[PDB]
């Protein structure tokens, strides 16, 4: 409600009372955890779903599946008292997030290894709603409770997004998008400490009309907002990307120790090319047909990338 | 930028970096002021006008209003010393900064400012809109903004000043003037707008959250008073309030009960017009009130002379 | 706590966890608010001490003085309800705050008079002072509310509660409600400023004393006895204990500059060390020559409300002794 | 230093300006990166304290030694392209920063090596090595870590860096930090020694122009010895307890907190023995000694909480039992 703040841009250090957008992606502790209802109602809520035939569910954001993880010992402890034998395993994580088309419930094989005995056409995904915030002086306490009414986006009660000056920002607890302003309104810089695949709420995005799809940079199916702050001139939708690496970063800038040459017919497109190879010398001569200065780049753990309208001659 | 605040649904107080929307419209004290960039050069834009056939400005914001006022001795001065037939005068807002289709174009004369219409310069001739904020200064009391002059023509309102947000169940557009406020129960709904001046620039839609497939007869806020074009600004069973009190003092809009007034949803009362004030000629407050299709509460106007209620509503 | 900051020195623009101490005093608006526990046991207080051996109270602290002067009239008319001939008249200060030996214990002929000069009628060893100490703090819109209650102990020290000292980095502070001492280091730590909401007479604390052992009486730039602390940083060189300034005048600010249109010189054939003169004389005329014995540039300077002042050891080159002011205090 | 803040004692956020003393040792990345004033004097040094008869230098701060490792290859390379037959090897530290000492002189403009931060070896002594010779010049700037630029000392001190040093106290609470320690002390009915956390322990010299009610102190009450950078305060002692000379000294991720190790029982009867070096709750075997004799603690005793779980304080010995499989400290500061 009441915040109280530094504006460099103004030039003045005021303190009063408005909304407050908070970077919550870039920081080395989790201030949030998500915790479910209680697990006497989710008890039966399995039995149902494995009396009818779900063979796991499918976490949505990291917080679900560390919630997975937290709550499996206890719900196993809780059951068996008059269910059957079932195996609910919370296993470690491979990329990215898919999107199961099956919902859990109304008014286990969990994402990980995939093991054909579970099919995914019959897997869980994107059944639970933020209800609501609880005290905590070591962390932030978020309820959960199952959604009524099945739909395709992400959830609305944590999507933060605001436009002060000349700066705009699209971002939760997963991303952190940056726009800026010198002659054109263009993208600034992307972080992403994951990847799921939800859709921005048509309600927190801004400047959203009249847009194409295809001129976007994050997809829509990355839940990347469907706005005209969102996409950059000279390049289309980045769906080719080392989307399934993590740690992603998105800005624009060279590659470390790398040059980038403009050519009047090089390769067009394609998928997303590695920078170094290891086993023969890191590449240094790089073509595009239409592109712009700084190029982007994927700051990924492993090391650096290109986008898809930059090949090496 | 660097900062600390409250959060209350989150039930948690915290410091970082982010965006910080502040709320700037209802405090009683004033935070800035306008600078123009030459004092010298407002002479020479002032004489290429006269020449060129533009009697005067209008203001966009009563800080323009300010600045002029302010530089009124300056300009004062400068046409003393250059030794020109020229005055310049400064009234009282009377109505709200209506709209001009001129600008200040570029390639015993009076220069007004604002007020009624005169005989020798209409209404139909005059500037609005050609000075746009480029940056900022260092003040105790007051934070200097300092202004220069466009290039292009934009009826649109500046950009560099307003500031939107969402986060969480609620959302904010506002500016230095203007702060409209929508919640979450149950659907998106608008709650309060708080007023303090009535422009007639364009919100811009880079600054406009839920900005598709938006309907222009559905805003409760004419897009010609600089309200934005989203589905924030709207609520069920309204339509577009072209004509309202529009032209009052430190208006407030609101959803709430006036003194008096029955809850009369009677599907016979007349077609939709004026609002109608609820005071009977400085007398009796009507307490029949009644809507063909509304909502409840109603729609009031906590304007500092009275109560109104919305075009929909007309009384018994 | 908890809060974000820019560092000049350091080209930060930081934000996290630690200790942040403000500068409560080179401000307009009050930020805090003193408020006694409640004014029907202030009453009762009031009642006992008059009744044993006590005429009056002298305030330690400005904000004790506007504590006062706001609940006399809820007091008094407490005391008129409970059917005591007594009254509380709160008088404006004068000079600085001195220190009186009673206290005051926790459980219209006659007048319990506040702040005031000397009066036949209270001598000043029939007086309380610094009888109450800080109990918490309370949530405020415009201004904090800060609770007190009565001291059980007879301490003569100023109240920790307030006081904020930090150093970090070639740069320290001390500094309470009222005080606010800079001291800096260019290849020696030594005094550079020291500004005065008030003129106080309580003692330091040693628990909030930066580089405290070994320290001379007679070296502090201003006295301890009129809460200066007890540290080396309050110190410079070539000078000693200004027991004898300007410690009367309000809104009083100590540097180390030239007062206008005047300059010094070092000889050592200059007078001896004396009150401080004044830089303009009663008639209003400027005196443009001073001299030091041993004294370092730039000289010491009072910046008062009156006007322009030096240090006790600067002195006046010729003019004479009979239409210059000097100070009087016997710090 | 202007800024805003949050004060739970005060129920008060607000802005201003003044001095921020800000936690920079619980931090999971490094702000700030020692760096040399120049690469190619560096190399001069080295030769002339090489030639006048230095064969290594010992770190004070564990950012000096890793300033040395990401030096290493540059000064090796200019050394070699100079044709200077000399190499420096930086080695990995053993325990706590010890001392030396000699020291690196000033800029004037078969095989040797210059070893850094090693152990007691016969070819390079503990008595030949240089030690505390840099000393912080200004900052710079960056987004990640900013840079602290350093200068060879012109005249020898066994004191601590004092631009990094920031010392506070506001109310109840008081803290003596730097970007190694952080010292915290409180007040409730007296003030004592409350939590100390470090990062590794040095053996420098605290100045007393950053300490705080350090008049008419003893050297034999201080908790932590003045012979590892401990403040010579009165905020540095708890009643009861004396200064911890065999403490475990040695070990890394320290923290010193005053309650109950897990599991553990402490008495305060009058039958034990007499102060000793600490002795871990946990023998060979992994098991816990579950009775703890004390002659005159005060409750709750010291906790070393090193990454080896659980120590205690000289006072604390362990009951009816006997000086087999228990691990105790053999460092004597």
Same mark, same amino acid.
């Given at each position: 409600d009441t915040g109280c703040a530094i504006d460099i841009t103004r030039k003045e250090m005021r303190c009063g009372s408005g909304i407050f957008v908070h970077?919550?992606?870039?920081?080395?502790?989790?201030?949030y955890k998500y915790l479910p209802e209680t697990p006497r109602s989710l008890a039966k809520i399995v039995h149902k779903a494995h009396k009818e035939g779900v063979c796991g569910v499918r976490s949505v954001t990291r917080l679900e599946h560390q919630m997975w993880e937290a709550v499996r010992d206890e719900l196993n402890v809780l059951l068996k008292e008059n269910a059957v034998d079932l195996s609910v395993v919370v296993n470690k994580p491979v990329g990215r997030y898919r999107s199961a088309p099956k919902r859990l419930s109304m008014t286990f094989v969990v994402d990980g290894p995939e093991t054909k005995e579970c099919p995914d056409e019959h897997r869980a995904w994107n059944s639970m709603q933020i209800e609501d915030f609880g005290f905590g002086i070591t962390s932030t306490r978020v309820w959960l409770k199952i959604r009524e009414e099945s739909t395709d986006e992400c959830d609305g009660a944590i999507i933060g997004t605001a436009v002060k000056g000349h700066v705009a920002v699209h971002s939760d607890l997963s991303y952190w998008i940056e726009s800026r302003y010198n002659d054109t309104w263009k993208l600034e810089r992307a972080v992403f400490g994951e990847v799921k695949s939800c859709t921005w709420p048509e309600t927190h995005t801004?400047? @959203?009309?009249?847009? !194409?799809?295809?001129?976007?940079?994050?997809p829509h199916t990355i839940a990347g907002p469907k706005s005209k702050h969102n996409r950059r001139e000279g390049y289309k939708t980045q769906?080719? @990307?080392?989307?399934? !690496?993590?740690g992603i970063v998105l800005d624009f800038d060279y590659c470390p120790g790398t040059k980038v040459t403009i050519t009047e017919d090089c390769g067009k497109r394609g998928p997303s090319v590695r920078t170094t190879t290891d086993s023969g010398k890191l590449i240094t001569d790089w073509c595009c047909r239409s592109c712009s200065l700084p190029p982007l780049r994927f700051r990924t753990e492993n090391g650096c990338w290109y986008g898809m309208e930059i090949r090496p001659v």
């Open positions: 970077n919550d992606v870039e920081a080395w502790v989790d201030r801004l400047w @959203g009309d009249g847009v !194409e799809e295809s001129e976007l940079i994050i769906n080719q @990307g080392p989307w399934d !690496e993590n």
